[PDB]
Amino acid sequence: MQLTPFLILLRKTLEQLQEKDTGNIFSEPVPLSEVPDYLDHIKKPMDFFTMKQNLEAYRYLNFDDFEEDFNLIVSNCLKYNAKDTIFYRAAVRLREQGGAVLRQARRQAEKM
Numbered sequence: 074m075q076l077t078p079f080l081i082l083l084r085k086t087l088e089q090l091q092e093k094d095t096g097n098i099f100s101e102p103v104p105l106s107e108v109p110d111y112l113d114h115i116k117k118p119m120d121f122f123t124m125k126q127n128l129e130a131y132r133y134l135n136f137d138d139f140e141e142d143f144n145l146i147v148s149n150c151l152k153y154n155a156k157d158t159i160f161y162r163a164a165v166r167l168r169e170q171g172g173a174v175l176r177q178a179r180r181q182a183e184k185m
């Protein structure tokens with residue numbers, strides 16, 4: 074397939090995923106200055122802003138590498154936060170609502 078339409082599709086998909094994060098709590102890296110223990114067991118932080126930087130740096134050339142970093146946004150949050158927190162429930166909801174978005178986007182990609 075051709076590169077430019079694939080990237081235009083990942084851009085749209087990333088926008089749709091960000092739309093599901095209505096609190097915008099995954100829009101930027103977790104502020105280590107406010108969460109000084111975050112990197113103790115989170116070995117690769119991830120967020121939507123960095124996903125955008127990776128997209129435009131041509132770091133996502135297939136749907137799996139894009140989806141892998143989205144999954145990190147979710148899994149890091151589930152790992153760090155207790156189950157009874159807003160953070161944890163937000164990651165569960167993002168996993169649920171993001172899953173449909175990714176499935177449809179991958180179908181569009183496989184037609185290419």
Ligand SMILES: O=c1[nH]c(=S)[nH]c2[nH]c(=S)[nH]c12
Nearest residue numbers: 098102103104108150154160
């Ligand atoms: O998962 C989190 N993501 C962010 S951006 N900030 C923050 N603070 C605590 S505590 N947990 C989290």
